[PDB]
């Protein structure tokens, strides 16, 4: 969502099975593991030289992007590190040969590498159920009006 | 639904008591006697066999 201090919880926040050696000292400071999500998705600059942990980010975290890739507009960001996406579409009633507008709310996960506000057409991808309702994860962010 | 489900139960349970109590005359161990008459129609016919 925004920038906080790293170790604020009651447990140490670290990337698991990433071990920096306290004996040998290197100019490269902290062992930070990161990957690329594939599907032609570029790793954001903030994910590579960041300082957060976020075990559920598709980058620098332990999840995967496989399955459906969706698109919608952000309607709320009041949660902690997750947002709500409104998907708008038209439904075809066959009897009347006409359409009607509908909408559905998708709760997705947003990493602390994207700065996401309302507006914000966002591309998300299916991400291995992470809390009861949240099955997608924010991948790409495009602006609303600038 | 529960009032509907209970009422159908209450009317059937009253119905099934009505069938049993009307059939209380014929538990043929002590208090029953069904009266049966064999009436053959032909003189060449014995009710004994």
């Amino acid at each position: 969502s925004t920038e906080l201090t790293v170790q604020s919880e009651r447990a140490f926040q670290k990337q698991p099975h990433i071990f920096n050696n306290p004996k040998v000292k290197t100019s490269k400071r902290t062992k930070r593991w990161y990957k690329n999500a594939g599907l032609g998705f570029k790793t954001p600059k903030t994910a590579i030289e960041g300082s957060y942990i976020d075990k559920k980010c598709p980058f620098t975290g332990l999840v995967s992007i496989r399955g459906k890739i969706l698109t919608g507009t952000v309607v709320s960001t009041k949660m902690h590190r997750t947002i709500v996406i409104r998907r708008a579409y038209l439904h075809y009633i066959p009897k009347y040969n006409r359409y009607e507008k509908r909408h559905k709310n998708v709760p997705v996960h947003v990493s602390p590498a994207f700065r996401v506000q309302v507006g914000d057409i966002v591309t998300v991808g299916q991400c291995r159920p992470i809390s009861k309702t949240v099955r997608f994860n924010v991948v790409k962010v495009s602006a609303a009006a600038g | 639904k529960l009032q509907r489900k209970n009422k159908a139960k209450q009317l059937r349970a009253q119905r099934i008591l009505d069938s049993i109590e009307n059939r209380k005359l014929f538990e043929g161990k002590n208090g029953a006697a069904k009266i049966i008459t064999i009436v053959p129609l032909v003189n060449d016919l014995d009710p004994l066999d």
């Binding site: 594939g38 599907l39 032609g40 890739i69 | -």
Partner: protein
């Protein structure tokens, strides 16, 4: 339902078995084996409904428990053994050898082969990985695994195991031109050459195939079974060579036959 299913009601069978919809309410249901049950052909269906050797259920049992039907060089006794694609089953009593290959219509067709070519069998490699203790192994399209393959064999290629010891002989790669048998979908049973592989990231690669009569069609990659080079296959093709004549020109092909 609390555990695996054991029966199969007739009319829930695969349609390409051509089972009579009357005459009993149950279907063979092939047991577990080298092929998925919706793409296989049980030994009871092959020897009773297809070749008309047997006549009952207990009669085809007497065929098999006599140890007379050898599927892929090994003897079988289960009447519902899933004999599938490119199985090279043989009958030693009549000295006749079969290869279960699809017709152009899409159903399994009997195809008598010589004693030669009844000792080898093509198989599409489906996954290559490293096993325990560092050995690499490939797995083909009928559940078989072979250790120590040639290092140029990748996923979705063709290997040539013989029959008795695995031992992958020369293999066929995947590029433009290679002759392709189709093993699933609407174009089930057609034979042609690759012209274009449009890779899609996310799933379900599509392959463009042009046959010998310049009729292009598109299929998923899962249904693609490469069998050799342009005009030179590695097996004996079935009758009709996979051309898919249209419904009008099949009737005109019929009309040349009745009468004399």
């Amino acid at each position: 339902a609390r555990g695996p299913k054991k029966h199969l009601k007739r009319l829930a069978a695969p349609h390409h078995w051509l089972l009579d919809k009357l005459s009993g309410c149950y279907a063979p249901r092939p047991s577990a084996g080298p092929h998925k049950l919706r793409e296989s052909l049980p030994l009871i269906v092959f020897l009773r409904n297809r070749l008309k050797y047997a006549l009952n259920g207990r009669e085809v049992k007497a065929i098999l428990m006599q140890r007379h039907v050898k599927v892929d060089g090994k003897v079988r006794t289960d009447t519902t053994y899933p004999a599938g694609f490119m199985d090279v089953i043989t009958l030693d009593a009549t000295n006749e050898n079969f290869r279960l290959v699809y017709d152009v219509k899409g159903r399994f067709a009997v195809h008598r082969i010589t004693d030669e070519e009844a000792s080898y069998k093509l198989g599409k490699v489906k996954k290559v990985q490293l096993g325990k203790k560092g050995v690499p192994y490939v797995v083909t399209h009928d559940g078989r695994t072979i250790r120590y393959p040639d290092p140029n064999i990748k996923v979705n290629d063709t290997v040539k195991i013989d029959l008795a010891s695995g031992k992958i002989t020369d293999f066929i790669k995947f590029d433009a031109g290679k002759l392709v048998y189709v093993t699933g979908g609407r174009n089930l049973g057609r034979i042609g050459t690759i012209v274009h592989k449009e890779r899609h990231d996310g799933g379900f690669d599509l392959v463009h195939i042009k046959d010998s009569l310049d009729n292009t069609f598109v299929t998923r990659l899962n249904n693609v079974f490469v069998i050799g080079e342009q005009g030179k296959p590695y097996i004996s093709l079935p009758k009709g060579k996979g051309i898919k004549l249209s419904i009008a020109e099949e009737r005109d092909r019929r009309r040349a036959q009745q009468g004399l």
